[PDB]
Amino acid sequence: SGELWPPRILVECLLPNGMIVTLECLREATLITIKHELFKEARKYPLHQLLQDESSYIFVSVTQEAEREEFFDETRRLCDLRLFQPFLKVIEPVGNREEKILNREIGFAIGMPVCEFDMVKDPEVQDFRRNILNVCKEAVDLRDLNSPHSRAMYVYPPNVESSPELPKHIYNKLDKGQIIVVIWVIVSPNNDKQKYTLKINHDCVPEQVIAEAIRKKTQGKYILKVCGCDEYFLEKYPLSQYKYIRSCIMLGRMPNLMLMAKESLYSQLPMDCFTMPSYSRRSTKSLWVINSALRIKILCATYVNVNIRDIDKIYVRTGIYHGGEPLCDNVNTQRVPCSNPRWNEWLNYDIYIPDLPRAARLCLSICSVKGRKGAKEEHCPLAWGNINLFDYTDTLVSGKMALNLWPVPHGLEDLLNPIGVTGSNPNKETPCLELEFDWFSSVVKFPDMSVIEEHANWSVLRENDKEQLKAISTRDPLSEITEQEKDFLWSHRHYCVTIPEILPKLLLSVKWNSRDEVAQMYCLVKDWPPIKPEQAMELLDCNYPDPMVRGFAVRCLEKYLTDDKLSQYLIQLVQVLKYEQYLDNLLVRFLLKKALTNQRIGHFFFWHLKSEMHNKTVSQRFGLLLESYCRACGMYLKHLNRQVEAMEKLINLTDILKQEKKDETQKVQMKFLVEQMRRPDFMDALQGFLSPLNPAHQLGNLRLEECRIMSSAKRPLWLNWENPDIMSELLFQNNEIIFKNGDDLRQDMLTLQIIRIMENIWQNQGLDLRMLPYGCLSIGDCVGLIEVVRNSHTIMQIQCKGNSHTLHQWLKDKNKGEIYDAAIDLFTRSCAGYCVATFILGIGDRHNSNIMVKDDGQLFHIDFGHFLDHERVPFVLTQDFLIVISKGAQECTKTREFERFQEMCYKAYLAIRQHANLFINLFSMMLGSGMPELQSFDDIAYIRKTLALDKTEQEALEYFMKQMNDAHHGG
Amino acid sequence: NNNMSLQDAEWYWGDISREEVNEKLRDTADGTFLVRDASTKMHGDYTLTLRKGGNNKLIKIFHRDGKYGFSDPLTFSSVVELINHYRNESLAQYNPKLDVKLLYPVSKYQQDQVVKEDNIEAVGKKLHEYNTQFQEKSREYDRLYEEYTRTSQEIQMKRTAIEAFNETIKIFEEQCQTQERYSKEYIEKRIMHNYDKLKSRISEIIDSRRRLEEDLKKQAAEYREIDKRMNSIKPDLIQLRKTRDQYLMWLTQKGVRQKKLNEWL
Numbered sequence A: 001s002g003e004l005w006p007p008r009i010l011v012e013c014l015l016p017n018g019m020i021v022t023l024e025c026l027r028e029a030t031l032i033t034i035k036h037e038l039f040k041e042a043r044k045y046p047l048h049q050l051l052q053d054e055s056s057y058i059f060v061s062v063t064q065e066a067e068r069e070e071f072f073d074e075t076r077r078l079c080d081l082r083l084f085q086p087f088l089k090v091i092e093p094v095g096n097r098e099e100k101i102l103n104r105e106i107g108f109a110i111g112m113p114v115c116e117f118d119m120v121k122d123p124e125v126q127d128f129r130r131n132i133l134n135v136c137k138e139a140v141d142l143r144d145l146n147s148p149h150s151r152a153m154y155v156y157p158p159n160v161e162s163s164p165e166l167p168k169h170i171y172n173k174l175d176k177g178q179i180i181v182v183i184w185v186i187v188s189p190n191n192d193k194q195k196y197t198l199k200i201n202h203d204c205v206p207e208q209v210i211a212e213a214i215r216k217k218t219q220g221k222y223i224l225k226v227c228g229c230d231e232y233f234l235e236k237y238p239l240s241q242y243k244y245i246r247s248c249i250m251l252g253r254m255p256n257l258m259l260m261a262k263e264s265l266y267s268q269l270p271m272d273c274f275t276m277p278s279y280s281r282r283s284t285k286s287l288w289v290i291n292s293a294l295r296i297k298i299l300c301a302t303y304v305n306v307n308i309r310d311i312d313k314i315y316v317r318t319g320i321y322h323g324g325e326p327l328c329d330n331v332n333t334q335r336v337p338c339s340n341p342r343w344n345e346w347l348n349y350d351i352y353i354p355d356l357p358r359a360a361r362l363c364l365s366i367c368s369v370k371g372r373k374g375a376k377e378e379h380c381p382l383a384w385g386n387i388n389l390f391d392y393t394d395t396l397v398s399g400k401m402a403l404n405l406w407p408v409p410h411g412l413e414d415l416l417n418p419i420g421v422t423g424s425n426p427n428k429e430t431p432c433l434e435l436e437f438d439w440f441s442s443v444v445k446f447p448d449m450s451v452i453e454e455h456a457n458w459s460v461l462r463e464n465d466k467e468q469l470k471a472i473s474t475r476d477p478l479s480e481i482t483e484q485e486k487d488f489l490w491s492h493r494h495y496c497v498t499i500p501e502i503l504p505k506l507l508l509s510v511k512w513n514s515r516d517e518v519a520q521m522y523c524l525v526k527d528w529p530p531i532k533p534e535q536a537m538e539l540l541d542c543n544y545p546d547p548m549v550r551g552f553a554v555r556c557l558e559k560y561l562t563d564d565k566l567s568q569y570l571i572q573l574v575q576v577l578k579y580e581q582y583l584d585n586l587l588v589r590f591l592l593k594k595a596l597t598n599q600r601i602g603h604f605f606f607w608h609l610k611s612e613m614h615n616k617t618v619s620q621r622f623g624l625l626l627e628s629y630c631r632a633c634g635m636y637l638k639h640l641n642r643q644v645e646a647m648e649k650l651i652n653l654t655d656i657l658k659q660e661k662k663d664e665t666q667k668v669q670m671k672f673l674v675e676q677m678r679r680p681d682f683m684d685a686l687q688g689f690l691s692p693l694n695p696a697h698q699l700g701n702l703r704l705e706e707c708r709i710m711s712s713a714k715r716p717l718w719l720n721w722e723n724p725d726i727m728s729e730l731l732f733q734n735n736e737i738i739f740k741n742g743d744d745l746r747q748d749m750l751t752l753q754i755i756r757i758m759e760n761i762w763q764n765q766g767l768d769l770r771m772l773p774y775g776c777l778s779i780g781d782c783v784g785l786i787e788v789v790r791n792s793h794t795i796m797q798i799q800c801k802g803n804s805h806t807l808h809q810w811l812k813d814k815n816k817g818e819i820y821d822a823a824i825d826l827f828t829r830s831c832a833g834y835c836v837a838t839f840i841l842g843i844g845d846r847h848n849s850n851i852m853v854k855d856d857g858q859l860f861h862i863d864f865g866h867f868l869d870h871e872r873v874p875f876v877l878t879q880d881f882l883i884v885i886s887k888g889a890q891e892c893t894k895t896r897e898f899e900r901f902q903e904m905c906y907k908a909y910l911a912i913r914q915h916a917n918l919f920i921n922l923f924s925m926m927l928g929s930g931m932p933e934l935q936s937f938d939d940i941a942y943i944r945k946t947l948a949l950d951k952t953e954q955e956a957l958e959y960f961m962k963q964m965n966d967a968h969h970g971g
Numbered sequence B: 001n002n003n004m005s006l007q008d009a010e011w012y013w014g015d016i017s018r019e020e021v022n023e024k025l026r027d028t029a030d031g032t033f034l035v036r037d038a039s040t041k042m043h044g045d046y047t048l049t050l051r052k053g054g055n056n057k058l059i060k061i062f063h064r065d066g067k068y069g070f071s072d073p074l075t076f077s078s079v080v081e082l083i084n085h086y087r088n089e090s091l092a093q094y095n096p097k098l099d100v101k102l103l104y105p106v107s108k109y110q111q112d113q114v115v116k117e118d119n120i121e122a123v124g125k126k127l128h129e130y131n132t133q134f135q136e137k138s139r140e141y142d143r144l145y146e147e148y149t150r151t152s153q154e155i156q157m158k159r160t161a162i163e164a165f166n167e168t169i170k171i172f173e174e175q176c177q178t179q180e181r182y183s184k185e186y187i188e189k190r191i192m193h194n195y196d197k198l199k200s201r202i203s204e205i206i207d208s209r210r211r212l213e214e215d216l217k218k219q220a221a222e223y224r225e226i227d228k229r230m231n232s233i234k235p236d237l238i239q240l241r242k243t244r245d246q247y248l249m250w251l252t253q254k255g256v257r258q259k260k261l262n263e264w265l
């Protein structure tokens, strides 16, 4: 689709005078080259006297996606034109030259044309595009306010920790508060690499590090840099705080730093141009005065897509849902024959009109009931929808409304879908429902602060209940809440402020069906003490839809959530960007401020949003989000257009390799990819671009000597890219990456995020369970990038390259020396980590081919994309692993080394169970993501079972001991 | 007499998880209820779950020195005595906001009558037959869903190409209108060959768009028709899943372990 919708290409140019000329032009010819020759050729026609000046002419044609784009960018070749039909119209240029060039970079980076966003006339989208430029301007001003240094902070942000304080176990690995490091100063234009060795403390800042280095060479214009990648140390932080240095000490290796002059870095950074776009220039009474009852009329359904013979009667099932909880009983319209869907019935609800909360959010459905067989009639949903009862401008909906109904998602059994996004199906081949709302002779507006505040305070220091209040706040969010606790919490709500962590539990105790208690709760939430960022993320879930609760949660995030924590929780924070109901929320104005301040966050903000545009439910919401980000991202639009183009030639390469060559064997496929990747079109695209998995790594000349189709499951691609950095021999010699096409990487990406979180919990607490969470990234629909972990072998393969003693003897083979006793240790502290983690998350079966071992004895899994499914213990220490752990002793179960392996697993399981609230919050935000094994709150109930959260601390361990003993057959 | 054994009562379901009881009270009449052992797994709790107002409530039954009740006055002696008192008297005395009493108890004896062939000889064989039917139907539905997704991508792709052909016609028609204005200077007194080619190209493009319009119409019908088959298969998959799990739930209490089910599934 990139080139055309041929050995000889003929374009039928259309001159303004109307000379339809058909001429042949080369594909490599640019737009300017064909423009110059066409005018010379057009002069032979009898109507050549009417031609005007050449410079006042431009090309206009049709793109693949039907966008009539204008070709101001004469630099682009014919292949890059993305023409639909071979033809070319010449008209005088109109509009602004710079604005349309930017509109083409944004259109290509997003994947859809930007001109499509200006067709929609909905007030919700239009006033979002115009009013989202306050944050975009504010962010751009902030990063340009200070010296050129502030420009560098955006481009090369620090990769730092959340805590300067080193853990006790880590701090003992460096002696007397001092660590050694090597500096690789380059002093001459000719490559003269010299290394200086110096002793630095764990508290010194890079300014002090620079001062010591200059002394060792025998005001500063020099800044540090990680050798082998584009990471810089230009922030006034302790040197031990940086993530690279922490990794170097904890893996026990040599940190290598290089010296770069500041002026060399600043000249690399270009200027920024935020041109203000074109669209930037361009009787009511309160709701509480109404005393009627909510009545809604379902006129008819235009189309329904179920069989007449199989399905007898259909009906419409509705309900008013305040973010998951029903505000009243669901109402059924009377059943009608499938041939003629037509109800015209005034549905009546129990909700008093002033009782309505802000996020009323009526939910619809169209079920089908047969009743021929079975006592319980089988209601099978046919469609679903959602309608906000209050517009974005605090106005109750009125008058007839037409809604388009989505199809029911796969693997969903509920008649309604309260989790679905409020809106209408853009497609015009879906069931359409006609609604009518009551009209109160005026526009109904939700009350302001004054009306709500005056409702409160108008209607109208303990002994032992503090213990119960503390006990309530320490339970799981999904724990058993009883009607006696909810009564107890609400009666003692004024003493709940002294325990700020109890807010998520107290909001569950409020009844939104009444405006008396809702008004009284708004007073408390107004002056609630701030809570921890890991607990304020709980309020951003689906269960809390109120604007004040979600507004309060962001207010805590803006002050508490840091840059490194934000990067960890970026997948979830994007996922709670669909549970919001209005486009002009507070989360977007908070997420975009960070994405326009950190290029490291901005790199993943783009890719996380870009991957979810395949779904049509959030294609428009995220399209407007990326268009505003891409416009104000800066000069990163040129880098983000290199990766999108590079990752599109790969998709086309794999797609024709999957379908057209499925019958072909690997031998022909190997020679087929050799020819296809040989073409200069792929050579230019797949070279010299930043890696999507890490903005710091650069992918040099794609090395073709070892770049072959992996002979594995879904024919992946194993691609080698050299390291173009000057000092590359210290970090990476070739950045290997596996391009998985046709496999869902969203489940794997979430699994590795939990594994990253778990390892932080163990290391911080005091354990030293070392595991390998590698890099994963989903880019589009069923397409992902997987980072290769360098030297490694599957244990299935390791038994042929070297009987149960094969794994131990192989480890003892390439570990000769004193280091052998440390290779088994690392094989133990990594075995224990992946046994607790797999058991808790319930990852799928673990063969001897999903298990990877490094030359140093480290162990890690190729995490399957099927978690919480296989109660079940996936990883059991086989007879191969038990020999290595017990130092080769035949009495594996009773040795001291295996005893220390059990007490290592027990301390790990107890540590995670103490931080079980964090893992429950993370799993509860990906409900609307669409993973088949995580779509409802009953799926997270598996986590609460394997962690034994219901039982006590001592009852939980005997649940773990028995569960492992069912396969290990011995303690 | 007024206090029977909880074991023989129909509403008391024993020990079931919260997720296993939400399905029982799913889309049910308001006022239905059942009593289950508390999730915390002590002795004598017997939390009561009730469906009122469209959502599932929970009520804990306190127990101290051999009595039972909701609040601290533990007047009622046994659990069966307490429930039978609130079936004939609304819960409004306990709480003004709780109105509907325990109208329709969820019973396990009726579900026992639902199961055929209590003898073990037929339970084992019938489970295999139902699982084979369920697995075959599930494979059929997964094939239809994959096909239905594929046709969704084709009509979306074909629809966009229709939009492009509409715009190309507009550009060519707009270019033709310029010729009508520009040909006035010549007709009042080559051009004829040029005009014929432009008319020929537009006519062919009109046919090309029309063929695309017809092809989309045929593809749209297949997209709709298969969506009818997919919607009809699902209810049958629903009924088979209930009965297959019912036999497995009845068979799993004969002394087998979960590891057998994991390997079998």
Ligand SMILES: CCNC(=O)[C@@H](Cc1cccc(C#Cc2ccc3nccnc3c2)c1)NC(=O)c1ccc2nc(C)c(C)nc2c1
Pocket (backbone or CB within 6 Å): A706, A707, A708, A709, A710, A711, A712, A718, A738, A774, A786, A787, A788, A789, A790, A792, A793, A794, A797, A862
């Ligand atoms: C499936 C079993 N059977 C095989 O034959 C295996 C055996 C074999 C040999 C050497 C390395 C490996 C590996 C690996 C690997 C490394 C890191 C990974 N992180 C994440 C996910 N998964 C990973 C997989 C496997 N071989 C391959 O899968 C294979 C295919 C193409 C290759 N092409 C090149 C250029 C190289 C260097 N190695 C390749 C390895």
